[PDB]
Amino acid sequence: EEFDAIKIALASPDMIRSWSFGEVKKPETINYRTFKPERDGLFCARIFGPVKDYECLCGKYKRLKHRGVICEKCGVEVTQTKVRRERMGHIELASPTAHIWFLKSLPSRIGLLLDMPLRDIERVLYFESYVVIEGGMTNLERQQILTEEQYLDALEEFGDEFDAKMGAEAIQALLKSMDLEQECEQLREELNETNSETKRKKLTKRIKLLEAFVQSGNKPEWMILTVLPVLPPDLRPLVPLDGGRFATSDLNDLYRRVINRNNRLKRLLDLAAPDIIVRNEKRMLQEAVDALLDNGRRGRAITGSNKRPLKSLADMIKGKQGRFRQNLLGKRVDYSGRSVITVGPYLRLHQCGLPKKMALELFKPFIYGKLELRGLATTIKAAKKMVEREEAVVWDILDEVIREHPVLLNRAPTLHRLGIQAFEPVLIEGKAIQLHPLVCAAYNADFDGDQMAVHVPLTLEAQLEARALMMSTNNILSPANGEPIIVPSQDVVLGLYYMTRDCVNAKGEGMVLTGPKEAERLYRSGLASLHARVKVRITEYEKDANGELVAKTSLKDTTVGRAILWMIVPKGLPYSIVNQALGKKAISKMLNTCYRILGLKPTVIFADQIMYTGFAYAARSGASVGIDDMVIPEKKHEIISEAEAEVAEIQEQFQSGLVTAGERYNKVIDIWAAANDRVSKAMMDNLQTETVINRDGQEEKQVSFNSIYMMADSGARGSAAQIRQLAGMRGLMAKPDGSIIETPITANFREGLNVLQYFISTHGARKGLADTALKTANSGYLTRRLVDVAQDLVVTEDDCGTHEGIMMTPVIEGGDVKEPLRDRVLGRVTAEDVLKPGTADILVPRNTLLHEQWCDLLEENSVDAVKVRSVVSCDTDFGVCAHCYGRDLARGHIINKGEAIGVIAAQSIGEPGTQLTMSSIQVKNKGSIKLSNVKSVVNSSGKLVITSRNTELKLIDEFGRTKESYKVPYGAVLAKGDGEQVAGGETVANWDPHTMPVITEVSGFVRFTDMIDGQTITRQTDELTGLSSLVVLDSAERTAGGKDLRPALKIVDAQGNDVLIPGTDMPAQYFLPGKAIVQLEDGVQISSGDTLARIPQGLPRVADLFEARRPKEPAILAEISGIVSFGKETKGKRRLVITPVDGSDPYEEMIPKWRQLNVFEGERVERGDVISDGPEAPHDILRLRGVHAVTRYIVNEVQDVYRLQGVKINDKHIEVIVRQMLRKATIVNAGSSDFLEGEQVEYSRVKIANRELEANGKVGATYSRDLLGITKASLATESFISAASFQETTRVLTEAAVAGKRDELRGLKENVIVGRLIPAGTGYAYHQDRMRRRAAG
């Protein structure tokens, strides 16, 4: 068994000879009649083997009497058959041919070896003419074509000392000639003398490459083919059909082609034919080879009479139709079934239907073995005939066998784990599968013609997994997020919401009950109202003492429904639980609380009884809909007459040649909107409490029985928008442009539609539908590419003994808290001693599991940031420590080693991603104000205005939480200064839409400077008012004469000097950008707060965030600190001369100057500071900042995008998938290894755990971190197997084999593809057995 690793190197022709069992010489396959093998063709039975076993063709020698005998009658060996799968032939060629993937693949592995270019050798081998096979005199070069009339000069010059003729043999001899060693050691010897610049690094490239081939062990001669194996017959079969028609694999075609051309070449070379035909035959042989190797890549594909091209070998490994994706990873199943589904309303949780027909079909082996055991069917003829005749015992024994015999259930698409579960059978003669209605949601399944599929645990590990793991009763929480999956579907909730209700109108007000018994006696007798708050007695309990119930009774004036319900409650809770009208939120929290304190089993029976009861009385509750449940409001004609008069006025306005259309058109839409929103009011007023039903009085009105508001209130179906679109206007409607129609839906469904309103709705319907049907692929790719990365994490030390790691702060932004820090802290270890807002009140000694005693202790405290020894910050090499991960969620305790995940992440993230694609600063409420890192100014008017783009407003509450978050234009006009307090509901900024003002706080003379007609600007009169100045065009419109120089109308005094900014020694003029149009002329004076210039006016991003593609257009954050200055002057984009304090200046990046900047031409930035208004590449963050800041940036952005959509995932996933991004360690120094070699950060830690230690102080090198993406990490892997599975298998196979790779089969897909166990799951015990063995010698 045991393995470490093994070596590989190229295919010897000796090896194909040894492997093969006989030359194939012919293309011939069979006879025309006697459909039987051909000697020395492709199906040579004497080579590959016979059909029967230990027998010769005559049948002399047989059955291991004559074991290693060859029947000399037919010369046929007495040998066995499973080798028929093995035994290959071979083929000896006329002339050498080469392997295309050593040739056409990127860096060639043969051209990169020689470093002599390609097209040279192409024409050497398209034989433009004679060609230097060997420039014996280096005067002549190899790979040098010599024409029939130029060759003679090489000839009569040297004659002897050159070989300049045709063929692949040129390259053969080349590879055989070149010697790698002494180049290597020489390049080293002169590396030591002067380890030069680019010169030496390419010396070094070669030196290490050379030695890599040396010590790796390689033989680039076998880059070139001389022997060609023959794939066995049954690897490329040829079979008949019923109608005599035959059927084949396309490979035989190419096999025949190659053999025929080769034999014809054997002919032409015996005749010394004119070698032009030998060239053509050589091109043809190499072509047929290369098409066996890769046909449709070279040129126009080869096709039959079909005109369709024919599949090669490579596609049988590659993409879909290869082994991997189609039928090695994903199979067709034995003993399965599937059919249409319907509801089981009277199921228990563990149950499922089984039409006994398919019960029998799948379980015939058990019932047969059992009919033999009893012996009624004495033989299998008897059992099969008895079971065709359907004995009565077949039924009782089918029940016997099926009793306690779990089975799986599968619906397409299997998004996450819970789409497939395992229930107990319930045998039925109903052709429809019955299904416990509550797991309609995990399946996303609703009964509109759906079919489920079914699978059979035969073995006992599978049976017991089905019952312990897939079971309906071990799965009660999403691991995406710890919510219950037991939601009331839509009916028991409607039921309960009806029961525990509290009217005023029906009857039976204020009498007394000793308890819910006479509540049921009354309500089942027909006396009380279920919905009537009537005095009763309760006797709840509580476990106040140490798990010790505490009895008590009391009275509570409560409804008949809550009363009657309360008995279901399992005597541990208070009555306030049931003392409201049971919203489904309450029901979530009910089974929550139930599970929490009780453990679980009550919550089980409890929920069963509640499903039971709500279904029962909801059928007794009655629910329907009527025409008058939607309205004919009394004010229907009057609204029409009013709208009639309004549009008549609009008509006459149009008649005038005034309001012309846009004002008119928008006016018309707005008035229609308001008119039928008033209709909506009329109607919802004319239903809900219109039932005036007196009772013992004058009159009283009460909620009428519409059923629409009720089914809208529980959460079953509907909501205010549904009810308006039935009632009021159906908002506006956008035609396919994305613009918005300005004459709406006026009517509704009851009143009656118009043809074109309908037709406009068809557009939005169709657009949204095509979005739905065409993004299952998008998640498809994102999920599956992420999973193919999937490796694991295993712990090794109790605590790494290491220090702090990550900070925890909650995720409240935009709205309320979205992850309590109470939860974020939950189960983790503290980085450190942590205090309370009563400070120096330590509560951990640097590390404690902070279970909810602590998280609640600290929810009690308003402490607002804590740190955690992170799994990242765990410094245990080749693993982590347990405290740093914190808690196992399933165990609910600090985690134990070995179990690990990450497709869990994939399901959690992808499964919801299916549909979930479809100026001002304010504070809202009281409290302190904590806004900073902004440049702003008290503008001319006396309130705050931004002058650094960074700020985004937040509406902070009195405790401190952000209630709202919104963005703010630079240079805006506020009515609030931050650090004030305001009543919410206020336009804090009344901004001008077009003007972006250019106010001059200074009072100095203006005069036209820096700015001249038709270079930096135009000067172009403001036509409407009529006065002007120098008029600053945008970026592209001005000519490039002065586009290289910033236009700045300048302020001066009577002296001409720089009117410095008031309070500082800084000059004050404005490098005017586009639209900055000054209206008053040269020499004019401006005032304080005076405008020189007036400036008028998805899931794809998910793909972008995950694929690590660069951000795109605009300028970015300060790359490096130190003074930064401007560069090359606008060849489209101007550059940025950075000048770091001690670092290096030369970096300069094209920036849109059209997109205005932040740091001026001689202002300093700190690194990682915004330069402009736009994003930055995350690679800038990893290369510039460390790891925590970058990963924080990414996870921030991505969960903002999701959280936007009403989304929730335990973000542990989004960080572990980023640990799996890339671990490429770009070395900083050299001395131990190369200077910037991509190495295992692991092995990096190893070397520094060896060399930097007293072996040296330091001889080696330090290292950096890297990114560049997930897919290339998939590629960039120890194994090539997991890499050579997915798309572009070809190039991966090339680069795999070229090293002679010999993967050690540890990763997931690695051991998978050979079907042997991998470290965990079922194989966990054996893997850790091997681990203890490795520890135990």
Binding residues for Mg(2+), by number, are: 446, 448, 450
- What is the amino acid identity at position 62? K
DSSP state of 896: P
Interface with Zn ion by CB under 5 A: which range of 593-601, 764-772, 876-884, 1107-1115? 876-884
Check residue 487 for interaction with another protein (CB under 8 A).
no
Q: Under 8 Å CB-to-CB from 460, ≥6 apart: which residues? A: none
Check residue 874 for interaction with Zn ion (CB under 5 A).
yes
Check residue 349 for interaction with another protein (CB under 8 A).
yes
Rank residues 88 and 1045 by Cβ distance to another protein and give the closer one.
Answer: 88
Interface with another protein by CB under 8 A: which range of 224-232, 570-578, 848-856, 1035-1043? 224-232
Distances (CA, A) of 645 to 215, 578, 639: 96, 55, 10
344 contacts 435 by C-beta, under 8 angstroms? yes
Q: Under 8 Å CB-to-CB from 498, ≥6 apart: which residues? A: 530, 531, 617, 618, 621, 710
Least Å from the CB of residue 318 to another protein: 10
- Euclidean distance between CA atoms 164 and 128, whole angstroms: 12
Check residue 124 for interaction with another protein (CB under 8 A).
no
Least Å from the CB of residue 869 to Mg ion: 48
Question: ∠ CA(394), CA(400), CA(402), 5° rounding?
Answer: 95
Rank residues 752 and 837 by Cβ distance to another protein and give the closer one.
Answer: 752
Which of the choices another protein, Mg ion, Zn ion, none does residue 56 contact, using the CB cut-off of 5 to 8 A by kind?
A: Zn ion
Q: What's the chain's length in residues?
A: 1337
Question: ∠ CA(1055), CA(1056), CA(1057), 5° rounding?
Answer: 90
Rank residues 494 and 895 by Cβ distance to Zn ion and give the closer one.
Answer: 895
Question: 607-646: which residues touch another protein (CB under 8 A)?
Answer: 615-616, 618-619, 622-625, 627
Q: After which residues is the chain broken (C to N over 2.5 A)?
A: 918, 1097
Return binding residues: 56, 58, 71, 74, 446, 448, 450, 800, 874, 881, 884
Check residue 317 for interaction with another protein (CB under 8 A).
yes
Binding mask 294-313 for another protein (x = CB under 8 A): -------------------x
Question: ∠ CA(689), CA(695), CA(698), 5° rounding?
Answer: 85
Least Å from the CB of residue 304 to another protein: 16
Check residue 324 for interaction with another protein (CB under 8 A).
yes
Check residue 757 for interaction with another protein (CB under 8 A).
no
Question: 58-77: which residues touch Zn ion (CB under 5 A)?
Answer: 58, 60, 71, 73-74
Which of the choices Mg ion, Zn ion, another protein, none does residue 878 contact, using the CB cut-off of 5 to 8 A by kind?
A: none
Question: 63-102: which residues touch another protein (CB under 8 A)?
Answer: 85, 88, 99-101
Task: Please give the sequence-ordered ranges of beta strands (E in DSSP) within 159-240, or none if there are none.
Answer: 163-164, 224-230, 238-240
Least Å from the CB of residue 837 to another protein: 40
Q: How does DSSP assign 1072-1099, residue by residue? A: --TT-EE-S-TT-B--TTEESEE-----
Which of the choices Mg ion, Zn ion, another protein, none does residue 57 contact, using the CB cut-off of 5 to 8 A by kind?
A: Zn ion
Check residue 327 for interaction with another protein (CB under 8 A).
yes
- Euclidean distance between CA atoms 1273 and 900, whole angstroms: 20
Least Å from the CB of residue 1257 to another protein: 44
How many residues bind to another protein according to rule CB under 8 A?
149
Binding mask 379-418 for another protein (x = CB under 8 A): ------------------------xxx----x-xxxxxx-
Judged by the rule CB under 5 A, the positions of this chain that interact with Mg ion are 446, 448, 450
Interface with another protein by CB under 8 A: which range of 3-11, 516-524, 960-968, 1100-1108? 3-11
Question: 781-810: which residues touch another protein (CB under 8 A)?
Answer: 783-784, 787-788, 790
Both structure tokens of 32: 């025309």
Least Å from the CB of residue 561 to another protein: 18
Reply yes or no: is the peptide bond before residue 413 cis, omega within 30 of 0. Answer: yes
Interface with another protein by CB under 8 A: which range of 191-199, 323-331, 382-390, 1245-1253? 323-331
Q: Given candidates 121, 435, 881, 1108, which one binds Zn ion under the rule CB under 5 A?
A: 881
- Euclidean distance between CA atoms 495 and 505, whole angstroms: 20
903 contacts 788 by C-beta, under 8 angstroms? no
Which of the choices another protein, Zn ion, Mg ion, none does residue 58 contact, using the CB cut-off of 5 to 8 A by kind?
A: Zn ion
Rank residues 518 and 1303 by Cβ distance to another protein and give the closer one.
Answer: 1303
Check residue 1322 for interaction with another protein (CB under 8 A).
yes
Helix (H) or strand (E) holding 1183: helix 1178-1184
Both structure tokens of 564: 């009657």
Least Å from the CB of residue 475 to Mg ion: 22
Question: 1237-1276: which residues touch another protein (CB under 8 A)?
Answer: none
Q: Where are the alpha helices (DSSP H) in 375-502?
A: 380-388, 392-402, 460-468, 492-499
Distances (CA, A) of 776 to 319, 332, 416, 782: 18, 22, 14, 10
Binding mask 72-101 for Zn ion (x = CB under 5 A): -xx---------------------------
Check residue 967 for interaction with another protein (CB under 8 A).
no
Return binding residues for Zn(2+): 56, 58, 71, 74, 800, 874, 881, 884
Distances (CA, A) of 1140 to 1148, 1151, 1165: 12, 18, 10
Least Å from the CB of residue 925 to another protein: 37
Rank residues 2 and 448 by Cβ distance to Mg ion and give the closer one.
Answer: 448
Which of the choices Zn ion, another protein, Mg ion, none does residue 673 contact, using the CB cut-off of 5 to 8 A by kind?
A: none
Task: State how far Cα 717 lies from the chain centre.
Answer: 31
Check residue 708 for interaction with another protein (CB under 8 A).
yes
Least Å from the CB of residue 714 to Mg ion: 22
- Euclidean distance between CA atoms 859 and 861, whole angstroms: 5
**Sign of the alpha-carbon dihedral angle for 515, 520, 525, 526:** positive
Which of the choices another protein, Mg ion, Zn ion, none does residue 208 contact, using the CB cut-off of 5 to 8 A by kind?
A: none
Least Å from the CB of residue 1109 to another protein: 23
- Euclidean distance between CA atoms 688 and 723, whole angstroms: 13
Question: ∠ CA(1296), CA(1302), CA(1304), 5° rounding?
Answer: 125
Task: Please give the sequence-ordered ranges of beta strands (E in DSSP) within 99-223, or none if there are none.
Answer: 130-134, 145-146, 163-164
Least Å from the CB of residue 789 to Zn ion: 23
Q: Where are the alpha helices (DSSP H) in 375-515?
A: 380-388, 392-402, 460-468, 492-499
Q: Torsion-angle region of residue 516: left (phi > 0), alpha (psi -120 to 50) or beta? A: alpha
Rank residues 446 and 958 by Cβ distance to Mg ion and give the closer one.
Answer: 446
Question: 794-823: which residues touch Zn ion (CB under 5 A)?
Answer: 800
Rank residues 118 and 918 by Cβ distance to Mg ion and give the closer one.
Answer: 918
Both structure tokens of 1154: 């059209």
Rank residues 232 and 886 by Cβ distance to another protein and give the closer one.
Answer: 232
Binding mask 241-260 for another protein (x = CB under 8 A): ------x-x-----------
Placement of tokens 């396959």 in the chain: 29
Both structure tokens of 257: 């082609």
Q: How does DSSP assign 298-311, residue by residue? A: TSSPPB-TTSSB--
Binding mask 4-43 for Zn ion (x = CB under 5 A): ----------------------------------------
842 contacts 854 by C-beta, under 8 angstroms? no
The SS3 assignment for 316 reads helix
Check residue 897 for interaction with another protein (CB under 8 A).
no
Which of the choices another protein, Zn ion, Mg ion, none does residue 450 contact, using the CB cut-off of 5 to 8 A by kind?
A: Mg ion
